Design a protein around this ligand. Structure first.
Ligand SMILES: NC(=O)c1ccc[n+]([C@@H]2O[C@H](COP(=O)([O-])OP(=O)(O)OC[C@H]3O[C@@H](n4cnc5c(N)ncnc54)[C@H](O)[C@@H]3O)[C@@H](O)[C@H]2O)c1
Ligand SMILES: NC(=O)c1ccc[n+]([C@@H]2O[C@H](COP(=O)([O-])OP(=O)(O)OC[C@H]3O[C@@H](n4cnc5c(N)ncnc54)[C@H](O)[C@@H]3O)[C@@H](O)[C@H]2O)c1
Ligand SMILES: NC(=O)c1ccc[n+]([C@@H]2O[C@H](COP(=O)([O-])OP(=O)(O)OC[C@H]3O[C@@H](n4cnc5c(N)ncnc54)[C@H](O)[C@@H]3O)[C@@H](O)[C@H]2O)c1
Ligand SMILES: NC(=O)c1ccc[n+]([C@@H]2O[C@H](COP(=O)([O-])OP(=O)(O)OC[C@H]3O[C@@H](n4cnc5c(N)ncnc54)[C@H](O)[C@@H]3O)[C@@H](O)[C@H]2O)c1
Lengths: 458, 458, 458, 458
């Protein structure tokens, strides 16, 4: 049987299955590359990362390559059902219709870890945020001895997985994809460069040419954000603590400034440099820190400025002081108006106010549609390709004197990375050259790769 | 001890070093930050890196931090005739000759090691040719009782150092200054970008907007060259063997093409796509391979095409065939003109000819000054920090029991690297903010300590 | 009695006015500067422009200067009920009905000029499309003996006015804005630059980095269209019929290619450059001519191409051929996909389909919100300033000696266009330098301008 | 006869003529099609256009198209050494003085019209400097009745030609070519974009990325200049006095500021805005005015500033203030140090100085080569067609009554300029589409005639 949200939905976004796969070539490419050859024939995966319209392509690719899966929703949104119902009518069992709240979602996890009540025959494990990893070790240690390997897609998981192997209660070698080059550059730098200036201009519907903006942090996301703003003709400034990133911002062609006098923050009203902040129309935070937009910073700001964030946490901007002492008003289904005069009793004609695109939540999710289909494709192919290396080694069948030697968390090998890069290049229409045997011996490389060392910095 | 190429040219060199000083922030940022406490007093330094308009600042900085030195040059032809006399004008000695002979090359290299007639108690040696770090062991293995470390800037000598570490004949620890980010970003990416189209236009004065050019390789130099071409209004094509670099090119808004039909290189003219090459205005090679531009590429080019090379290797373009078959002719004291009519007896104004810029060697050989003072600062800065770290950790004065743990090659720690950029960012007029105690403990790094892990690629 | 259909929507309608007026510094500056003098005291005005939001702001603007207006719509589709009811509650009846049978179009035009039972005083006429201007010359000519002036903003209206002046049936002087500088530059070049890449992403969500597009037409609209796609990361090509404009395309960085063999079209399929059309992804048409994208262009396109028109009407792309051979399918009320397989049905999994955006009609204002408020600001400021200057001369009471002498159709004085520009720059926060009395005569112009000749090309 | 310093320079001059010959598609495609038919058969042309190696092909095609030509240099310094001999070897008399004095070329003017003392019976003047036109009526009023066509180059000549027409002193038709389309956007817009960064880098060798510059004026030269700095990673501000071009600058991504508070210049130190002049380090003056950069902003400028000029005279920047209190020093042939300390106290270790490149004169022609050959191809091909069009009208053969109305001063017709553009494009490899007869009437034109109205701004 099967239960996700309902049955009849087949035409809302289900047609995007054809559209997205045509816009995401790497998954459609490697499927033709491995036909007849079935590298994953007999693998049992459960699988849970982020259910979307552009996520079922992973399930289709694993099904084509011979894997066996049973999908359950992860978090935040259980049913992005735009094409979830098509899975069940095809034959794949999918369970997501639950008692819909965020305090019970373990009941969504409980149904993917097992089939009938006995723990499943899992040999590789597919989960994003580790929401599945502790369940095996803390609750159901029985099946766990048969697992060849596991993989995950965030720092929130690998952090414990490294600690949870340090104590020795991890019994399974793990593979981390977050260090793959085609994932780091795609998901972080490029995903924002398309989504950000779109998301800003959908809610405000304002003109961005000729205005001045501030960007907090110049990490991996800061580069893409600054590129997206500069390509529209804005005047962009950058705030940073890392000297290397400040160097790379100066070289790239940006001005770096400090939101505080001399970069020293002490909480006093005499420390915030009002002159610079009194002429800024936009501030965006990228840092993965806490309380980066101080309250005293936020009250010396220029009239009618715009507040935004693309970071991770809800306390990048001091919203605790924001949801108090000042009034709130909704103008559109996703943007808000806040008055600086006082707690309550604002006038319609008043001049003093600000605007908040997503309060403290990420703008590209509340005001946009996440990431485009092509950019995020450079990571789901790593998802389907990491299982290849794990399923070929049969870790659960090795002798004890051999298992103890090769139990470790590892990074994806660079040959699979080159293969996925080539397959996603061939979708654009490019042609890759090849080296004659005389040239290879001169450079010291094989013909089928890899071409670069592990210490290389792409 | 004033045995210099010419003694009367100091002032001009000094005056030109003044502007470099104005354009290299870190060399005096350190000289002002660490002044007074004298961290490098008592050290003995002998080095041979080419004496030019920018290495004098390094030499002056090391002698300014309190040490005493005697100097020589690796390459005699790399000696600058002006600034060499500036060293001769003071008590600091030098052996910067221009004898034009390789017989005296080994005499000048040898003269560094000895005091005058017995070898010097060198605490360290810094090298760029790799000849010094070998002559300590081939010919004079008795000073090593007084050495503390070695420094190397070049590649192909670090390979020798690694092989020698496995050989076991070394007695000295080694610092790999090459792998610094401030070293990598400046020389590879930034340096080529500023000087490539500059040199092209200096050499040929050709209008570049509207042309179509093909770039071989998309490495660091390839990235520095593609943007420098495209910013001028040129349509750029890119070729590559590595799928990752080709993908990076595709996401930047380029086209990936192959000189061969389906990318397979057979050598015969029937395996060559002459359709593409009949409308290409420029061919530049950025790689470090061998025979990249094969003899049958340049036989089927369009008339009046431009060929040049920007990689270090001297045989990436087949000039042997051009010497074998076709005539040569000089248009300017640096540029040459090649006729395809035959070996000799070229016509006065025949239309079938090519143009070659610098005999297929480095475009920086005689057309441009190479890099400005502000870009090579990423290399000169780390050299003094390596010795600041090395001098205090006294390997020689350490007891023999504990010395066995210090034989290795060290990549410069990230903490020292961050100090270098803070001087360069501060020289541009920017400001770097600080961390409150709440924020530092929140992410896991101290207020003053390093910020990024070692797996993080910038 | 005012008649705006849902008359109880005024309270909801007035909401968006308070936030829109802050994004047009020009009209607010006109209200702030010319208050107290009451420039338009006693000047009754008839009007026809459509009403969405900002024309209501203009209505609020000129009535603040002492004027009186009656009003109706022009475009039939631009009948946002919310802005009209706001002004109706603000104090003057409005007649913002839709076309219906086009009699209520005339009836609302009728009531704009006709009271309960008689025509009555009227001085200014502010039309959009020349619909009322015909009615004054025809129908009711006895009222023209008191009519004071006419203002129009379309290029099809200036041609009719000049043709009318040739015949001599014109009776009252007229002023036209479309040939002005700020109006044309903000409407044509800018705006489409801002709006095109916004409209493409809203309807398709596709990635734009590293992709190929073809643009036909390189006029004023097409020049702004091309830059919108370039900054997003496409490789675009320009097709042009006029030798002068194609010269700028090559000098801008775009290769100029023709869709036909040697550019000669003769009605045969063997006359097209087939090697080019089987490689394009995006087509944008920016002409005003019939059959610029002929039936052979589409029949040789690459599969999965997206087409857009920002030109004139459904004659540039041969939709007539497309609606007797090819079937249509709906996706969402922005886009369609059109199958080249045939007419009698289709299968959803085919690859030979074509993507259509805002079928056969303008896209930048069809699948988007059009130009933002800051760009429409300059266009609306010209007409309200025209009614000012066209009032002092007092045409209606001039004697016959001068009444027939001043009958002319003319573009705005250049000084008025510079007054509009000053308020726009002060909106962004810029500062304009002043000329000292020893520095303005060198150019030959007074301190207050205008500083440019009538034949200058900006 | 010949005033060349040495006649032995022609041998390599012809070869350099050949190598520069391939860079001008227009001057060769005009002959390449007009050959066979003789449009200038018997046309005795007298010319004084600036002779250079690129104009060698101009002279050669003009004499190969049927005309006979005598030459001179109406500017003392506008001469390239090789071309004079390289074209005198063919038998064409050239009187260009390499002695470079005033009265010597003044003598050469009066012998440029004398065959042997009997004036040359020429029918036309291809004038460049206008002094010939002055002495036509001033020195020998006898040839006013002989010649029947004049074409001139500089706007300082039309400033006399088109207003002295008021009395009909020269009853001869003349055509002005400066306002032509293919010249209005070749010499000024794209030339500066190509040449400005090369000019600054050849003299300074600085690293442009990361610096802060200020460009004053936003004309065509200003529009071209700004992009050449933005593309080099520079952050720059734009100031102006004309509101409309400032409005354009706001849309191009530049911030508008003023060196004086509120924009009012009152001639005292209390008005200079010290906030921004303490951080800018490069000045480019792109406007033709006096005291655009007066003394106060020079006294308040930062130490590391570089002063550049792209105007015409030495009045845009106050050079007189420099010489009477500040001493000058040279380090590069056209780079100077402006020591702000004063006359005496000349210390070398100073940080208080400025960098002035071309003494305040036009920097581009003082520090770099100048315009490329392809850019100059469009600027020179117009004179040929102007002379030809004045030949095909034959003013001297018309009856005297009809000669009264044929007298007029009119700009070049549009069709000739369109043909120039067509010839220029095909040198880039572009292909232009032809109009079919049905679409020709829809716009309302013929299939080869002019397509744009006479007042259309491109
Ligand atoms: N919205 C999305 O689609 C999306 C996608 C992926 C990741 N993210 C999130 O975006 C966030 C951005 O992280 P990243 O990848 O840029 O990290 P990063 O490692 O690349 O660097 C973060 C930057 O913040 C800077 N920073 C930290 N504290 C600072 C402070 N107090 N002041 C100034 N600068 C400070 C660091 O120096 C660094 O430059 C992450 O938390 C990630 O989870 C969002
Ligand atoms: N001229 C300069 O200023 C300068 C500066 C630094 C380095 N270099 C030299 O340039 C060379 C490469 O530059 P780099 O430092 O960026 O190294 P790199 O290894 O990153 O560049 C070589 C690139 O070419 C690619 N490549 C290899 N073989 C190829 C082939 N047959 N066809 C096409 N592409 C091919 C490689 O995959 C790589 O992307 C080295 O020899 C280096 O020493 C020159
Ligand atoms: N959507 C909007 O926001 C908007 C705004 C203004 C104007 N327009 C429309 O744009 C058009 C006016 O454009 P413009 O103001 O740039 O005027 P324009 O005359 O400069 O544009 C026409 C251009 O297309 C070229 N062209 C004409 N026929 C061609 C052909 N067969 N092949 C190739 N090129 C051809 C012309 O040479 C010219 O360069 C009109 O159709 C008008 O309705 C749309
Ligand atoms: N070097 C070259 O290649 C070249 C080419 C063309 C012309 N020129 C010469 O140099 C000058 C540049 O011509 P252009 O095409 O730039 O002319 P332009 O008239 O098109 O532009 C000059 C601009 O400067 C503005 N301006 C005037 N006074 C100003 C002031 N005090 N401060 C700021 N802005 C001010 C004007 O409003 C105008 O917009 C010409 O006068 C000509 O003699 C040089």
């Amino acid at each position: 049987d099967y239960k996700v949200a309902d049955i009849t939905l087949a035409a809302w976004g289900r047609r995007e299955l054809i559209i997205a796969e045509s816009e995401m070539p790497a998954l459609m490419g490697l499927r033709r590359k491995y036909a007849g050859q079935q590298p994953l024939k007999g693998a049992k995966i459960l699988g849970c990362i982020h259910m979307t319209i552009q996520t079922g392509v992973l399930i289709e690719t694993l099904v084509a390559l011979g894997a066996e899966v049973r999908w359950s929703s992860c978090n935040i949104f259980s049913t992005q059902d735009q094409a979830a119902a098509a899975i069940a009518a095809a034959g794949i069992p999918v369970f997501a219709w639950k008692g819909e709240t965020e305090e019970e979602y373990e009941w969504c996890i409980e149904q993917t870890i097992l089939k009938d009540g006995q723990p499943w025959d899992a040999n590789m494990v597919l989960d994003d945020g580790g929401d599945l990893t502790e369940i095996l070790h803390k609750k159901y240690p029985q099946m766990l001895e048969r697992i060849h390997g596991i993989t995950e897609e965030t720092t929130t998981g690998v952090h414990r997985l490294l600690d949870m192997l340090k104590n020795g209660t991890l019994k399974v070698p793990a593979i981390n994809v977050n260090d793959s080059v085609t994932k780091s550059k795609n998901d972080n730098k490029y995903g924002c460069r398309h989504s950000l200036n779109d998301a800003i201009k959908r809610g405000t519907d304002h003109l961005l040419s000729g205005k001045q903006a501030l960007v907090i942090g110049y990490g991996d996301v800061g580069k893409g954000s600054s590129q997206s703003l500069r390509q529209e003709g804005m005047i962009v400034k950058v705030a940073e603590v890392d000297p290397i990133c400040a160097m790379q911002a100066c070289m790239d062609g940006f001005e770096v400034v400090s939101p505080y006098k001399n970069g020293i923050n002490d909480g006093t009203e005499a420390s915030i440099d009002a002159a610079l902040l009194g002429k800024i129309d936009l501030i965006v935070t990228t840092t993965g820190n806490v309380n980066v937009c101080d309250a005293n910073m936020l009250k010396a700001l220029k009239k009618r400025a715009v507040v935004c964030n693309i970071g991770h946490f809800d306390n990048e901007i001091d919203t605790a002081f924001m949801r108090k002492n000042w009034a709130w008003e909704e103008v559109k289904p996703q943007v808000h108006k806040i008055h600086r005069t006082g707690k309550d009793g604002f006038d319609a004609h008043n001049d003093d106010y600000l605007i908040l695109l997503a309060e403290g939540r990420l703008v590209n999710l509340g005001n946009a549609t996440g990431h485009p289909s092509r950019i995020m494709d450079g990571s789901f192919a790593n998802q389907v390709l990491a299982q290849i290396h794990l399923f070929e080694q049969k870790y659960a069948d090795l002798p004890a004197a051999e298992k103890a030697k090769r139990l470790s968390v590892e990074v994806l090998p660079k040959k699979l990375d080159e293969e996925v890069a080539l397959e996603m290049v061939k979708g654009f229409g490019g042609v890759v050259t090849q080296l004659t045997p005389k040239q290879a011996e001169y450079i010291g490389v094989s013909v089928e790769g890899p071409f670069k060392p592990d210490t290389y910095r792409y």
